[PDB]
Amino acid sequence: FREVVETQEGKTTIIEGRITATPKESPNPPNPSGQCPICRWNLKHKYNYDDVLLLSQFIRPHGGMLPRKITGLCQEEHRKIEECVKMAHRAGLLPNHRPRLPEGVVPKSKPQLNRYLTRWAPGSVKPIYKKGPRWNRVRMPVGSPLLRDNVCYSRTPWKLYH
Amino acid sequence: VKCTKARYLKKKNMRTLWINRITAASQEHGLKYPALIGNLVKCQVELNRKVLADLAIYEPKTFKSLAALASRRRHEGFAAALGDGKEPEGIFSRVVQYH
Amino acid sequence: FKNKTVLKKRCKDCYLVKRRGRWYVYCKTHPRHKQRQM
Amino acid sequence: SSFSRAPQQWATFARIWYLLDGKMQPPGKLAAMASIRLQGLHKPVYHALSDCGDHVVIMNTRHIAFSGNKWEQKVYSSHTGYPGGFRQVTAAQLHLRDPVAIVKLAIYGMLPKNLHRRTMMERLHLFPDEYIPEDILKNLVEELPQPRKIPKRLDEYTQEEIDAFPRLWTPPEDYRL
Amino acid sequence: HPWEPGSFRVGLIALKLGMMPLWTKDGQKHVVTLLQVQDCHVLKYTSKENCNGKMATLSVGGKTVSRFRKATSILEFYRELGLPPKQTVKIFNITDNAAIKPGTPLYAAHFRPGQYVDVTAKTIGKGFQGVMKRWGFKGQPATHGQTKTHRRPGAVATGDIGRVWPGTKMPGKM
Amino acid sequence: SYLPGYVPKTSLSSPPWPEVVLPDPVEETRHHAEVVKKVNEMIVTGQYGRLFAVVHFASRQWKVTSEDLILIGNELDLACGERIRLEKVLLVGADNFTLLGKPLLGKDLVRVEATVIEKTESWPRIIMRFRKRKNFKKKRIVTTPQTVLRINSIEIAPCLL
Amino acid sequence: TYSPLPDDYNCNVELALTSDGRTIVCYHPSVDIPYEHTKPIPRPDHDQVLKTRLEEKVEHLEEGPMIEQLSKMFFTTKHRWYPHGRYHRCRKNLNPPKDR
Amino acid sequence: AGGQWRLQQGLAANPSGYGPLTELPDWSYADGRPAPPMKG
RNA sequence: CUCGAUGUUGGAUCAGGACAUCCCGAUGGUGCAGCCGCUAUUAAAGGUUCGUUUGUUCAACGAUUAAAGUCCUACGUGAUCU
Numbered sequence A: 001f002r003e004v005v006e007t008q009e010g011k012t013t014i015i016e017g018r019i020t021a022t023p024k025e026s027p028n029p030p031n032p033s034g035q036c037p038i039c040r041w042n043l044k045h046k047y048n049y050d051d052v053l054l055l056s057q058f059i060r061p062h063g064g065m066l067p068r069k070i071t072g073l074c075q076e077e078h079r080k081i082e083e084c085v086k087m088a089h090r091a092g093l094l095p096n097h098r099p100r101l102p103e104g105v106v107p108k109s110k111p112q113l114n115r116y117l118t119r120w121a122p123g124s125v126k127p128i129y130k131k132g133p134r135w136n137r138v139r140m141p142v143g144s145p146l147l148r149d150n151v152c153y154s155r156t157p158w159k160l161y162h
Numbered sequence B: 001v002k003c004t005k006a007r008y009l010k011k012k013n014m015r016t017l018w019i020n021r022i023t024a025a026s027q028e029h030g031l032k033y034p035a036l037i038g039n040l041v042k043c044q045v046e047l048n049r050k051v052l053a054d055l056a057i058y059e060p061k062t063f064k065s066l067a068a069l070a071s072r073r074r075h076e077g078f079a080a081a082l083g084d085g086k087e088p089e090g091i092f093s094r095v096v097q098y099h
Numbered sequence C: 001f002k003n004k005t006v007l008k009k010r011c012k013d014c015y016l017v018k019r020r021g022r023w024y025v026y027c028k029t030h031p032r033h034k035q036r037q038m
Numbered sequence D: 001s002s003f004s005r006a007p008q009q010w011a012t013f014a015r016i017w018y019l020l021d022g023k024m025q026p027p028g029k030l031a032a033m034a035s036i037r038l039q040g041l042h043k044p045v046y047h048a049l050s051d052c053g054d055h056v057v058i059m060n061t062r063h064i065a066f067s068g069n070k071w072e073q074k075v076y077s078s079h080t081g082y083p084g085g086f087r088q089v090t091a092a093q094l095h096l097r098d099p100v101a102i103v104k105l106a107i108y109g110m111l112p113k114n115l116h117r118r119t120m121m122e123r124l125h126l127f128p129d130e131y132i133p134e135d136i137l138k139n140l141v142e143e144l145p146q147p148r149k150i151p152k153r154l155d156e157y158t159q160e161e162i163d164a165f166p167r168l169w170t171p172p173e174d175y176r177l
Numbered sequence E: 001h002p003w004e005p006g007s008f009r010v011g012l013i014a015l016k017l018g019m020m021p022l023w024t025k026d027g028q029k030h031v032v033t034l035l036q037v038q039d040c041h042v043l044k045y046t047s048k049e050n051c052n053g054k055m056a057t058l059s060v061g062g063k064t065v066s067r068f069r070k071a072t073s074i075l076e077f078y079r080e081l082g083l084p085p086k087q088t089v090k091i092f093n094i095t096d097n098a099a100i101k102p103g104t105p106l107y108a109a110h111f112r113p114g115q116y117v118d119v120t121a122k123t124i125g126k127g128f129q130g131v132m133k134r135w136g137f138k139g140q141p142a143t144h145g146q147t148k149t150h151r152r153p154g155a156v157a158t159g160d161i162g163r164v165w166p167g168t169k170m171p172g173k174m
Numbered sequence F: 001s002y003l004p005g006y007v008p009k010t011s012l013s014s015p016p017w018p019e020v021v022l023p024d025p026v027e028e029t030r031h032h033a034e035v036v037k038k039v040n041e042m043i044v045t046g047q048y049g050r051l052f053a054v055v056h057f058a059s060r061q062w063k064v065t066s067e068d069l070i071l072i073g074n075e076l077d078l079a080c081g082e083r084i085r086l087e088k089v090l091l092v093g094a095d096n097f098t099l100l101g102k103p104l105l106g107k108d109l110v111r112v113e114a115t116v117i118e119k120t121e122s123w124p125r126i127i128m129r130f131r132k133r134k135n136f137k138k139k140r141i142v143t144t145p146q147t148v149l150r151i152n153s154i155e156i157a158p159c160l161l
Numbered sequence G: 001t002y003s004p005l006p007d008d009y010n011c012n013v014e015l016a017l018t019s020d021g022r023t024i025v026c027y028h029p030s031v032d033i034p035y036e037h038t039k040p041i042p043r044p045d046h047d048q049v050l051k052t053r054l055e056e057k058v059e060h061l062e063e064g065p066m067i068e069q070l071s072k073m074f075f076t077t078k079h080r081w082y083p084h085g086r087y088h089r090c091r092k093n094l095n096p097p098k099d100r
Numbered sequence H: 001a002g003g004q005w006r007l008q009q010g011l012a013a014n015p016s017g018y019g020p021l022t023e024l025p026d027w028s029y030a031d032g033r034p035a036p037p038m039k040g
Numbered sequence I: 001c002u003c004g005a006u007g008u009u010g011g012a013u014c015a016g017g018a019c020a021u022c023c024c025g026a027u028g029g030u031g032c033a034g035c036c037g038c039u040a041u042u043a044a045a046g047g048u049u050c051g052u053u054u055g056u057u058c059a060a061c062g063a064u065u066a067a068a069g070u071c072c073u074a075c076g077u078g079a080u081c082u
């Protein structure tokens, strides 16, 4: 990877770029014919929001996603890994990939509400004051429909609406 | 009239009580009710629900054995399903034929 | 804002953003183009 | 068993004390487990008229996790009876106001809708944090396993676990990241 | 202890003597109520821990009454305190630094001019009252045909609900 | 060191249940013979006390033990005091072992005897129909013939091979 | 080392078939609680010249407080502890049938 | 409740149907004599 | 559904509710300088006049008002009245 450093000395600023150590794909992918990193390692349909060892390899130090052209992911798996990282952040599973805070700002405290499988941004959802009849019931989404094709080891498929 | 029609409820509710008690008894050994009932039939054991509940209350060493047998047969099913028929049937999967 | 079921950019500075769970049209050049998803 | 009759009857119909840890647990799966035990449905001698419910103690009810967006979407409705008395609160507002309410409301709704239900509520013991009264603690017999596996945060993996998982792609040497 | 912000001290029990005018330098007339402090003492201290509330409490007592007309447990309490019984006892939420040893007398100069006070008492009992006196309902016309209906509530709900809402204003003790 | 179908460890890489390895059939069939011999020895040596059995009689199953009474819901065409053998035995159990038929245990293995101790009829049982507004009402009373059997003896023979 | 169920609580189960394959044999001896899994019985809980008196704690409560005490002690609601009228008291069977 | 499995084995879906559990005699005289045939 | 009766338009009395908001709050747009407007989003806690006239609901008119809202409640309410 590549860094950028700005050092100001004697009213003079010097902006440079250094090349740091770079990781490399582990040798012998179980499926070298795979197109994207996922299919090359027989990982399609086999990861979830809690598999951070996988998800942490496709995000920036501050929790942002990395571009598809750089990672090489298929457009499809990019959307799965993108949703999975959104949910992993909201589950408190990426406690080091936190947003950069300018000028040492100390955020005001928030209520701790543990959560998992959170499809929507918490501040963006309204209360369900009128649940509606049983034949038109306003449901609560759980998980993501992007992961519907994940391998299900139970005879019942994932329920995405509670 | 309630007494006449209550004969249908009495039979229906006895079965739900037996099932409820068997579900309790199976869970103590880590089985679900259908895994126990389904696999006992596959072992050719035809003990019905009333007897099984009686065993769960009064003969728990026996009931645990019935649980182990059903659990064993269920594992033979998993092993069989994984195979393509080349492997022989499990020990407790073999059916006694009558003629 | 005007509430709209179909959001249409009216210019070339009119940009589409989703905030608060709904889509918006914000235009800094022509504020009369601002739309809200209904 | 060769017990005498009364000690035999006493042992069979005794009340057991269970512990359940609500940390990171969905309140409904805590509720499903407790509802069985409070009713006695886990006992092969179960009968509705036999009064064979058990004691369930649940700690860490403040640290329950809802799945999805239920912290914001789930609403608890009530009416004071007076005109204008309809009150609706989200699960989050309720949790911050009363840290056992949500688990209490999940359990209460799962118990039979009959007159035995408020009695089964008297053998339920909810505590928001790790503290449990000593008298309650000395009653306990068995701790139930948590119905949800808590997934590890990335910082909690050992370096052996990190090293075991393979690097799936090579980042360009010239990418700023 | 010295006073600190957030600190809450005790109040008193007084007897309402009556009302009187006074005038301010501006020439404005204000009526005032005379509250006499009659034998006010601290009776009990309850620690913040034992009160079951967020504050400690200090129980104060008002007027000396007859030992002959008080219950034995109450007489037993006052014998241990070493005071004659009080007619009324009230609980005051205080901060820990404001606690006073029970048996301590309280006076009118506990308060000072310019301060504001809240005064709590039981209102004058008026007995069972109709809606006009109790709730300010208008009643009905005096003439123009009215049949036996001059001071009545009128309708008490709508037909649809088939009931009367809890909290409905009705004749009762005032 | 990665097979063609290798999948790195994730939450869904493998099934949630643990892997189970069934015993080798050759060893187990040997292990089975030792267990059967062990249980057959307990029968020869009488290392058991009270036995219970499950019998299929008159359409239903009865968990029975010596001295038990069972109420049969029909006439049996046997004189009071007559001793009979119960021939459909599903299960005989002891404190420390149980024998299971598939579905019935062999006659050479277990013997259950019972005695007719009463031939009677049940208490009267009402059968009443009613349909409102239809002048539809009927009453019928029935008593069912019954037989009380006492289980005398449960005997097992060391015929396990 | 395969076991269908754990063998550490109720009995050590061993399943077997006879040579003919027609009889399933179940050997289930009970497991005994090991000594090391037990606790010792809880033994642990003047100048007086006067015969120690019985300190009889004769204390009377009113129905309300009494029922609160019984409800808490036995973990019930209050409703069990209230009386019933003559009609229901006189309907209860005082010589119920007894089975063994 | 086991009906489809019994059918796969050439058995009646209901164990109350044909086969020894139902068709064999229920009892015999304790002396050995066979019982008269059951009505069903 | 009610004809072996579910009597009463308007008014009085007491009002419960909706929000499609008349006024008071917070916003966006404006052919919004400002003062007033117009239009939209949010908001139902609180409020929403007295008269002349007509049996009237409706309307007109005189004075006001921050405003004199639209609706439902058996055209709310007649074992409370008219």
Ligand code: FES
Binding pocket: A034, A035, A036, A038, A039, A040, A044, A073, A074, A075, A076, A077
């Ligand atoms: S997973 Fe193979 S193309 Fe993306």
Ligand SMILES: [K+]
Binding pocket: I002, I003, I005
């Ligand atoms: K009519």
Ligand SMILES: [Mg+2]
Binding pocket: E138, E139, E140, E141, E142
């Ligand atoms: Mg008047």
Ligand SMILES: [Mg+2]
Binding pocket: E147
């Ligand atoms: Mg008159």
Ligand SMILES: [Mg+2]
Binding pocket: E146, E147, E148, E149, E150
């Ligand atoms: Mg009059």
Ligand SMILES: [Mg+2]
Binding pocket: none
């Ligand atoms: Mg009529």
Ligand SMILES: [Mg+2]
Binding pocket: I015
């Ligand atoms: Mg109103």
Ligand SMILES: [Mg+2]
Binding pocket: I075
């Ligand atoms: Mg009307």
